[PDB]
Amino acid sequence: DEDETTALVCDNGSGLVKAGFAGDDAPRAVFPSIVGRPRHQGVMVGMGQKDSYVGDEAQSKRGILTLKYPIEHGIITNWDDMEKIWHHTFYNELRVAPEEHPTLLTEAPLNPKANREKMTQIMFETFNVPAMYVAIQAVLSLYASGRTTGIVLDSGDGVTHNVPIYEGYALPHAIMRLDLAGRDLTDYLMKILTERGYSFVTTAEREIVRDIKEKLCYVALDFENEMATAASSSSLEKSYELPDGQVITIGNERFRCPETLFQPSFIGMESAGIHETTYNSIMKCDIDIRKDLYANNVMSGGTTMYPGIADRMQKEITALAPSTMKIKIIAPPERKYSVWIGGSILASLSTFQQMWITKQEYDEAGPSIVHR
Amino acid sequence: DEDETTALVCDNGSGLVKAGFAGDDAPRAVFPSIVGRPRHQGVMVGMGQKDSYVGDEAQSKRGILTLKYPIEHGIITNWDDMEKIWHHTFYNELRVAPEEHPTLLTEAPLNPKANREKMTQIMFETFNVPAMYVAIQAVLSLYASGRTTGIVLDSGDGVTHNVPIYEGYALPHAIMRLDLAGRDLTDYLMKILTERGYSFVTTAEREIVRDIKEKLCYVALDFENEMATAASSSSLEKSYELPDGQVITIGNERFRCPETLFQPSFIGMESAGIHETTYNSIMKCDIDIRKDLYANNVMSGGTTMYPGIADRMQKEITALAPSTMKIKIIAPPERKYSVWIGGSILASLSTFQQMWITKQEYDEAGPSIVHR
Amino acid sequence: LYNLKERYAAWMIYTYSGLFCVTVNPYKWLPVYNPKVVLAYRGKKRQEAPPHIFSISDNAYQFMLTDRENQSILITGESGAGKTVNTKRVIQYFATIAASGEKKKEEQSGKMQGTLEDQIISANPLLEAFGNAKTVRNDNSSRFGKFIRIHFGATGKLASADIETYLLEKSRVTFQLPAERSYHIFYQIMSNKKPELIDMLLITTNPYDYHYVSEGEITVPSIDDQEELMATDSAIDILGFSADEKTAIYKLTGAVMHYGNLKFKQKQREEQAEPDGTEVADKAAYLMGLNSAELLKALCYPRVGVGNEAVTKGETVSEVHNSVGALAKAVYEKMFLWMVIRINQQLDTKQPRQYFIGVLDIAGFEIFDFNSFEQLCINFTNEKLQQFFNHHMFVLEQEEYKKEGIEWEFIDFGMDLAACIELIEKPMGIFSILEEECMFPKATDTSFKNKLYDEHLGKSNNFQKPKPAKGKAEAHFSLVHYAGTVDYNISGWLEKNKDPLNETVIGLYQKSSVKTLALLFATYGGEAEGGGGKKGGKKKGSSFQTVSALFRENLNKLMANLRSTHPHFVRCIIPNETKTPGAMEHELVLHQLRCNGVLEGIRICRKGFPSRVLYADFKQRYRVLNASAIPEGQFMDSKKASE
């Protein structure tokens, strides 16, 4: 129990932090990855002067603060502001004292060696956690779907990745990163919806375009004869009621937004798209392992939640793969937390105890120890 | 007690001064904002030659003096004559010595920086008050209705304003000023009542048109089919008995006077009216704060006291606002003193002590100190 | 720790620790308060006699006439330390050793109403019935603080007295912990020694009929409610109260019981409160000189005044029950205050006064896993009191090194605490932020909280964010007091600090047939002018703006009175939670010592030249060393001697 209860799992994202206790089924804490700094001197009624704001209080009060994102494209870019988000996570969100809890953290696919050593330096030397561990994100997603070999298409708020994993070892030279994700996708909907003849003028109009994207957006299979369908004008249309009455209608654009993930050309991106990239990762891997990867395309991440994403991907890679092959696109329902759940499982596991980096290992080996 | 008893609250208006002690429920002193200067040399029986007259003695003796209004449209226009009204307030009306009383004063919505510094220069350097503070009027009105975010429609004797306030900070760029108020409104009634076939000939006829406006005037909802009602001639009519017998009847015009506040066109004004202006203030503010402002339209000022003002405004902005919105027009009964009461509360408060500008701050920082 | 302990196991309760006069609860009887002792300690410096309270108390007197300065005695300790006992005992002392009403001295209804020396005394037993109760620690715990000014004459004979009350435990009136009980009075009255009373008040003799007063315990073996009732009764009289008033008091004390019996129910299809009967209201109404109806309306349909008018507001069941309770408490309090005033009034004589001796009885810094508003107020009081000492000592010390000719320079010892005090009492400090927000019609505890931080956090050292775990219950803010770190919970503060009362009802009181009740409310009725419309400042009309606004004013008026005084200190101690004579838990006594000031006086002593002997205390004990030449020195000049 000492640490059975006690292991923490913190998944640091570009848009959201997911956090909680190893053992739980889902994150106890989910909140924006921002750190707000007040543009002016003054106070809220009853509070003192605050130097900084994190998560939702930074989002809610955004009009008087300069908002900053510590993690650009999955990589920690500002370490002063990240230690601020961690502090908030332990002390306010989970309300635990960190110096008696083992902490499993996550990093990104080709996270620079030096960063994995730096967050270890900050975990052990400024938070004084007993022990910690850094798992790679795609690797926890795979594992949370039971398996050990497969290829994960991972897509969240600032990055998309393909991480081919074989008997647990993520394959460095076959990993692909596509910098277009849910953030890019909300801003494109924004324009095709103002372009539908609308105005997201006040900040209460801006924010909810993102809630339109999440609730009403679709990834149609045969996106071709779906536009064609749009035109005959079926009961395909969908009206959403705004903060007030102002019933906005979205028929068609509803799927023009996730067609951006297959066609980056919709947004002036010259890069290849999700399905081709799944494939290219795969023809960059060893030959003998390619049947395995093909029957185990595990999807994880908030942006892979658009319904019919899996069917489109299913047919997208069948028709690029040699017919002798078995294609299989696994997309679980909890996928917006796969990464986290994979960490919860792993860290609560009976056999993981012997991989925890302890302060004994650290004080004796330097940050190098956990770096592997 | 030193200053718990001792804080003064002086609300300077275009028509009236409201004054008294922080702590009280209502102003100890209310009187016209005039300064009379005798047109001829001579005396009243038993008095000496008087150079000047202020408040009610200036009104009562108006036939031999040239009357002057120091505050034009809420802004202090003559500083020689204002120091005269302050002097009168402290020494004669409240009969206090100012050099041992902290003084909370009020200013108008976009009061020029230089004025807030000038009345501070006169408070500290010619009245020698221990400490003082200048609150913005709409902001004290809001606060006296308990809240901190809302939009105040403030309307008195020379100005009308809309001041959107968010967690206490009045929003400069969303404030609207409409120069038509109770003064304009008494003169319009005057004409629609002489136009009813009457004569307000002597000064005892002039003054009481204003007491007709206050007692008998109404703001009808559906001002349309209220004129229509007037015609069928119901028992809608209302006769007032003059200083003498001369029973004057006012049926209809009774509401044609406050319909001027929604239709400025009744008086050759091309500006928009109260309700549209409430609204425009609101579509000039941030988007995310517009649901707050809509559910918190606080009314203050002598001219917002016309019964049924709130119902007309209620329906005036519901029908301009998106139906998804909650409208809420708060109009308290003490509203002709909201501003003052908000100051009484605030200045008698336990936490306000640390915002008082003291002579220590001033003698050391210059007028800049209180200016903020 | 060890010295105290040893002389206790030997049954010596009075040991000095510098200037202090430590006192340990015997938990049994002692011939110390002995009428022989009283004399013995009469005219003796504390070096001419062993450690004892009369030493302090006599010296004060002495000093009083010798130096022509006023004096003070500061008694302080935890709930079970037994201060009242001392306080009282000190008081008798004064009365005895300097009375002489000449005519009042005879054995003819001696000490009955009609003399002060008695009034002076009789005072206690009234206050005690109303401001005292069975605590889980004491059986007669003081639930309030107090300050008496014994105004001595020119000659040196008694002339006047002056009481002042601080921080009364209003909550007992409505609540009570399981092992505790409410004020005595209630139980006194229902005891049945004066049966008329029961019928007069319209109550029963079974407390379980009055929820407000039987939530905890009803009977205490060591107390004879029947005897006290008279004590109380008789005291009132002596105190000069009018029968009527003496009738108001009673009648008023029963109304309050009744209130807690007032019941309500939800109006059908409405969320409004509607009276669940006019059985009790009737009694409460009559007893207060009210009208049942008018009363139940005001209660149910509170008619407010938002804007420039008076808007009738409807309340919920939960809202009523709570408002009632608020008046119950409000009324009791006020009354209590009044009684004190009335007492003071009798204790007012025309004879000249040249000096006084103040006896202050209040609580000491107590730390709980749960520290709320009340704790701050008390702690703050103590942290002040402490600085008050640290200074007196600095002043004092420095005289010696000046008298002797030593060359020691040092900074005021008070200074160390100024940091904490400023943070609380200064303008942008806690109280202010607390009392400002109270002006915001739509503020939250949460609101207040943030304001507290944004402004003090990171910028102030004594200011800190809590340590939520250990024996503590939640988080908000810790302070760094001299005694240590106190973790404060801010929840209810805003309210508690606003003293919200249904003004409609108060209205009724204000026009009662029961003058006294009417009186008690006057000061509320006279400030309403000032807070006429919604929002604003109550102070405009003389109404309190803060729960804390006075406390401060009173605490200032006090600490000022304390200054024009020659401070004399007394620290009361509590041996063991278990109530056993001759015993002591260590850490329990250790605690007190830190929060007492005792350990801080030792510190300041040790900076340096630890042990410091008072001259007579020096003569006596050591004359024998060069017997001839040391005795001559000590006798020839109390000081020059030791030299």
Swiss-Prot record, chains A, B:
GO terms for biological process: actin filament bundle assembly; actin filament polymerization; mesenchyme migration; positive regulation of gene expression; skeletal muscle fiber development; skeletal muscle thin filament assembly. Its EC number is 3.6.4.-. The modification N6-malonyllysine is found at residue 61. The modification Tele-methylhistidine is found at residue 73. Oxidation of Met-44 and Met-47 by MICALs (MICAL1, MICAL2 or MICAL3) to form methionine sulfoxide promotes actin filament depolymerization. MICAL1 and MICAL2 produce the (R)-S-oxide form. The (R)-S-oxide form is reverted by MSRB1 and MSRB2, which promotes actin repolymerization. The modification Methionine (R)-sulfoxide is found at residues 44, 47. It catalyses: ATP + H2O = ADP + phosphate + H(+). Signal peptide: none annotated. Keywords: Acetylation, ADP-ribosylation, ATP-binding, Cytoplasm, Cytoskeleton, Hydrolase, Methylation, Muscle protein, Nucleotide-binding, Oxidation. InterPro entries: Actin (IPR004000), Actin/actin-like_CS (IPR020902), Actin_CS (IPR004001), ATPase_NBD (IPR043129). The modification ADP-ribosylarginine is found at residue 177. Polymerization of globular actin (G-actin) leads to a structural filament (F-actin) in the form of a two-stranded helix. Each actin can bind to 4 others. Interacts with alpha-actinin. Identified in a complex composed of ACTA1, COBL, GSN and TMSB4X. Interacts with TTID. Interacts (via its C-terminus) with USP25. Belongs to the actin family. Actins are highly conserved proteins that are involved in various types of cell motility and are ubiquitously expressed in all eukaryotic cells. PANTHER family: ACTIN. This is Actin, alpha skeletal muscle. It comes from Oryctolagus cuniculus.
UniProtKB/Swiss-Prot annotation, chain C:
It is found in: Cytoplasm, Myofibril. ATP binds at residues 77-84. Residues 555-577 are annotated as: Actin-binding. Keywords: Acetylation, Actin-binding, ATP-binding, Calmodulin-binding, Coiled coil, Cytoplasm, Methylation, Motor protein, Muscle protein, Myosin, Nucleotide-binding, Phosphoprotein, Thick filament. GO terms for cellular component: cytoplasm; myofibril; myosin filament; myosin II complex. One of its GO terms (molecular function) is calmodulin binding. GO terms for biological process: muscle contraction. Its main location: cytoplasm. The modification N6,N6,N6-trimethyllysine is found at residues 28, 449. Residues 1-643 form the Myosin motor domain. Muscle myosin is a hexameric protein that consists of 2 heavy chain subunits (MHC), 2 alkali light chain subunits (MLC) and 2 regulatory light chain subunits (MLC-2). The rodlike tail sequence is highly repetitive, showing cycles of a 28-residue repeat pattern composed of 4 heptapeptides, characteristic for alpha-helical coiled coils. Limited proteolysis of myosin heavy chain produces 1 light meromyosin (LMM) and 1 heavy meromyosin (HMM). HMM can be further cleaved into 2 globular subfragments (S1) and 1 rod-shaped subfragment (S2). Belongs to the TRAFAC class myosin-kinesin ATPase superfamily. Myosin family. Muscle contraction. Myosin is a protein that binds to F-actin and has ATPase activity that is activated by F-actin. This is Myosin heavy chain, skeletal muscle, adult. The chain holds residues 104 to 746 of 1939 of the full protein.
